[PDB]
Amino acid sequence: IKTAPVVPPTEQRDMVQEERVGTPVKNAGNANPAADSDNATEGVV
Amino acid sequence: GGEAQLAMGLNDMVAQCFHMHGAQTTMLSTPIISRADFGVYHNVVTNMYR
């Protein structure tokens, strides 16, 4: 048995951190966001 | 993307930048007083008569 001094549970707080490597684009779920333009065969106002 | 705005650009350019000559110059027999610029040809009938 080894009794060791630890940090009291009430003087620390677990905080969830979300780590990201880059900011997702506007049309993140779209494989081809350029197909709204390539399929505008009548024009756009 | 300005495809819809070129069609408006043509019709706005043509109306703004195209001028005809009216009946007075080309068809009607108006005197020089009403056919010609008054700031220059206001004494041209009097002097040509002289």
Side-chain angles (χ1 to χ4, degrees):
Chain A
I1 297 169
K2 185 179 288 292
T3 287
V6 307
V7 176
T10 73
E11 293 179 354
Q12 51 171 22
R13 216 196 284 146
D14 287 31
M15 302 155 188
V16 56
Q17 270 282 301
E18 169 80 38
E19 44 174 2
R20 66 215 272 191
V21 289
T23 309
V25 299
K26 184 162 31 73
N27 319 101
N30 217 347
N32 193 16
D36 278 276
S37 308
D38 278 352
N39 288 313
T41 66
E42 271 276 280
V44 166
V45 192
Chain B
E3 45 267 20
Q5 278 83 40
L6 188 153
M8 307 174 190
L10 294 174
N11 304 139
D12 298 353
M13 199 267 305
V14 161
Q16 278 158 25
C17 301
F18 276 86
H19 306 100
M20 282 274 260
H21 262 293
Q24 289 94 6
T25 314
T26 64
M27 273 168 304
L28 293 205
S29 57
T30 72
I32 289 170
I33 190 167
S34 305
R35 219 197 287 195
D37 205 45
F38 199 74
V40 179
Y41 313 89
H42 59 284
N43 309 141
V44 60
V45 176
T46 305
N47 299 7
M48 182 186 337
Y49 191 62
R50 282 182 188 137

